[PDB]
Design a binder for this molecule. Sequence first.
Ligand SMILES: CC(C)[C@H](Nc1ncnc2[nH]c(C3=CCOC3)cc12)c1ccc2c(c1)S(=O)(=O)CCC2
Length: 169
Amino acid sequence: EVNSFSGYLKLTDNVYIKNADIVEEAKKVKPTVVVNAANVYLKHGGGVAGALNKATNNAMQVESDDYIATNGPLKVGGSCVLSGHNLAKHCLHVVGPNVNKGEDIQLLKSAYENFNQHEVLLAPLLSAGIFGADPIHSLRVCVDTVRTNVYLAVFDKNLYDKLVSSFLE
Ligand SMILES: CC(C)[C@H](Nc1ncnc2[nH]c(C3=CCOC3)cc12)c1ccc2c(c1)S(=O)(=O)CCC2
């Protein structure tokens, strides 16, 4: 069926969260939109972006290279809509700031604002992992900024539990 999300915990009227791999969620749910945690040149070299690209058997990377050739790189805090391939109807490539590389944490609000152009999205926790943002802060920005229906997949039970505890304080 359409957007068949299961086993999520509803945090607010529009934010849900699950301990899950976003790739496995995209394969089972077939969401209208899957968010990729992209970089400005759409080079999906590892982490979340490498895993989504691998699940499309590199079709996502070829399409991203053609997009960059015609349009140039994205800006930090920006996004573009490309094909979802076998994972979704569309992939929304969003660039959150990479704090470990000196980018401004304030741009995380701009990054989440891109989600508001889509009614329902399956997404990762922006700027977390090796991008270096505090994951509790990233969830607070998501809850305060996103107004459409967002299903967050966080592939780590330890981090999932710390995020739910922090939200329910
Ligand atoms: C915080 C962690 C748990 C989270 N990881 C994930 N969150 C959700 N679905 C995931 N699948 C995988 C797989 C990796 C290999 O096969 C699938 C990772 C994973 C995450 C959240 C955002 C970011 C990253 C990582 S990053 O890739 O380090 C840099 C970009 C921002």
